[PDB]
Structure formats: structure tokens, C-alpha cells
């Protein structure tokens, strides 16, 4: 199926407490493979996946270099953004950036992106055509104009349609055992006793990859979306994910309820019943 390579950058200013915090993580699909933490000992881009580990010195020196560059721009940006908004020196503010590339089942470029936020909110973004921008507000306009004048979008398009997708492909091979795998959910049902006339019926999805999943509870074949407790997809910490959905059943009515699991690691959708 389709695949992605995404880099996530978080810049946090620390008025008084040294330089700003800079974090950079990289993902291929739902699997992180590298990290940089302005606080960490190394000051290098580091591995976080077993496959990227034997990449080479040239690769690690190059990536270390660029993430240190990304870092600088972001320290600078922090100052520039305080000015655009006439914000005070003592304020602690956030900047986030995400960029990456997708390829289809054919491994050919599909789409690219570059998202930038200030204070957990849209600041400026590359449009889907990779030539123009969408500046959220009046302050972001100045950046829009700046990058437009500097053909920033062309060299960005160059990377996302070339180096990005061609490297995603490289990684998909370097860790084809990790990245070309799907762990189908390990499912089951539990049944507790809330009171004497009610009971909790919980459907479980465990140890699955990738993250995308659908759990739905049904009464008499009729979806209970409005009466289901659905928790967000969390990480098992071992590279797989978990999830669960619960309904409250008027005792005896257990027969009427079924959990439905959809995951790409399944041949058929699963229909679970308490029986």
C-alpha cells in the first residue's frame, strides 16, 4: 500500500533558561527511525529503529549537520515571530513544523507537504501543488511574501518529489521486515459487572500494525457510535498499537451486541460476540 516519510520539529523558547529547546523526530509510516534532542548528550541525529542503524558515517554526519541547521533557523524564527506579534521577551512560545512525502502502492511520488504552526495554531503552509502558500493571518503574510520572493517553494518541491520519495523507498528496503509488515490485531472480549442490572462489555485490539484501525459496537446490527466509549489508538511501546471500545449493556442483552474489527492485516473483518 501507500507509505510515508515524515519529519516533526518542535521548537520551544525558554526565556532565561538557555537557548530554545529543539526536538526533531522522523517517521516512516507509523515507525519512528531517528531523533534529535537539543538537550541530549550526543548533539547528533541518532537512530531509533534497528534498520537505519547500519546506515553509515556519511549519512549520520549529513543528517546531524542538517538537523543542526534546522535548529538554527528555528531559534531565529522564534525571535522573528515574537516581533510579528508584538509579544514580550519573557514569553515562552512554541513553533512546530511537519514535512514529508507519500508514495502510492507503486512507490512513485504521490503527494508532499510542509506545515508550520505558531503557538499550536496554523501559521503558514504549502498548498497541495507545492508552488504556492497559504498564510493563516496578517503576520504570516510577511513570511508568505518573503518565501515567494525567494522561490522557497521550488527547492522545497524539488526535495519532496526527489530526495524525499527516493529515500522513503530506500528505508522501506533497509527495514523491509519492519516496514513491509502488518501485524493483525489480537482481539478478545471482556465482561465486568458494573452493578446488578448493568455490565461493561469491552472489545480489545492488541499488538497490531499499522495504527489505522476501526472498532465498532453494534446492537441488533445497528451501530452504537453514540453509546460507545472509544479510546484513541495508543502505542504498546514495542512498535505495535492497541485500542478498545466499550458499551454498557442492560444485563441479559449481551446476546444483542457484537464488536466489529477492521484492520488491513485481516483477510475478513472480524465480528465478535459474547457467546
Amino acid at each position: 500500500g501507500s507509505h510515508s516519510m515524515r519529519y516533526f520539529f518542535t521548537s520551544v523558547s525558554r526565556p532565561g533558561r538557555g537557548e530554545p529547546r529543539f526536538i526533531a523526530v522522523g517517521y516512516v509510516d507509523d515507525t519512528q527511525f531517528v531523533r534529535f534532542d537539543s538537550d541530549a548528550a550526543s548533539q547528533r541525529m541518532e537512530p531509533r529503529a534497528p534498520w537505519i542503524e547500519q546506515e553509515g558515517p556519511e549519512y549520520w554526519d549529513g543528517e546531524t549537520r542538517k538537523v543542526k541547521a534546522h535548529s538554527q533557523t528555528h531559534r531565529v524564527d522564534l525571535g522573528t515571530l515574537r516581533g510579528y506579534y508584538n509579544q514580550s521577551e519573557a514569553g515562552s512560545h512554541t513553533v512546530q513544523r511537519m514535512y514529508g512525502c507519500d508514495v502510492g502502492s507503486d512507490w512513485r511520488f504521490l503527494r508532499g507537504y510542509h506545515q508550520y504552526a505558531y503557538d499550536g495554531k496554523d501559521y503558514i503552509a504549502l498548498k497541495e501543488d507545492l508552488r504556492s502558500w497559504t498564510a493563516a493571518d496578517m503576520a504570516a503574510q510577511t513570511t508568505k511574501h518573503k518565501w515567494e520572493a525567494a522561490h522557497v517553494a521550488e527547492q522545497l518541491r524539488a526535495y519532496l518529489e526527489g530526495t524525499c520519495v527516493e529515500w522513503l523507498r530506500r528505508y522501506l528496503e533497509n527495514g523491509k521486515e519492519t516496514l513491509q509488515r502488518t501485524d493483525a490485531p489480537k482481539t478478545h472480549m471482556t465482561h465486568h459487572a458494573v452493578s446488578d442490572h448493568e455490565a461493561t462489555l469491552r472489545c480489545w485490539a492488541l499488538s497490531f500494525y499499522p495504527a489505522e484501525i476501526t472498532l465498532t459496537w453494534q446492537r441488533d446490527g445497528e451501530d452504537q457510535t453514540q453509546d460507545t466509549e472509544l479510546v484513541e489508538t495508543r502505542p504498546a511501546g514495542d512498535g505495535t498499537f492497541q485500542k478498545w471500545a466499550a458499551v454498557v449493556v442492560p444485563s441479559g442483552q449481551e446476546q444483542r451486541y457484537t464488536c466489529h474489527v477492521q484492520h488491513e492485516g485481516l483477510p475478513k473483518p472480524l465480528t465478535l460476540r459474547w457467546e
Binding site: 516533526f8 518542535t10 520551544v12 526536538i23 523526530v25 517517521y27 519512528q32 531523533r35 534532542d37 531509533r48 515562552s92 512554541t94 512546530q96 511537519m98 504552526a117 503557538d119 499550536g120 495554531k121 471482556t190 465486568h192 469491552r202 492488541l206 479510546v231 484513541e232 495508543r234 502505542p235 504498546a236 511501546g237 514495542d238 492497541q242
Partner: protein
Amino acid sequence: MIQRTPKIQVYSRHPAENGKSNFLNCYVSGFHPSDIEVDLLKNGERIEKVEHSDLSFSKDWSFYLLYYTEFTPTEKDEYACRVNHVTLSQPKIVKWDRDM
């Protein structure tokens, strides 16, 4: 300025069975800003060999982290997650229900 409240989940990496080694996870997500205090507790008592994942964020810019500690469940021991954030008027404590 934008502030979002952390959601908190306390769960084990594998199904929990007394006497067998596992990881205690505390997944905090959907928060903003990224500053957050997260503790794991053994019978109302801070655990020290705790690690966390690298700061990442979702489609809405809100952040998420995973805090985890190697541990081994027992019949009687209690486990919980203590979380403080700007959006909380006091540290929130979420107990681990193991069944579940």
C-alpha cells in the same frame, strides 16, 4: 493563547499476569503547550527508572508522549499515573485498572 488538556491512559504493554515482567505505560496526548509533568507511581510513590518517547504531535498540533517503566505485576501492588499541566488546576491521578 492556545492550551489543550492532556488525555491520560494507563495500561500495560502485554496482558498483565502476576509475577511476570511487563512495561507500565502512561500515554499522554492532545496537550498544548508541550510542557508536562508525568510520573508513574507504585502504591502512591514515584517510580525512578522511568523513560519517555521523543516529543511528537498530531494533525491538530497537539502533542503526545509515552512514559514507560519496566515492572512486574503482583496481586496486591497498586500503580498509577500522575500528570500535571498548565490546563490542570492540580496534578491529575489516573489509576491503572489491569483487567481491564
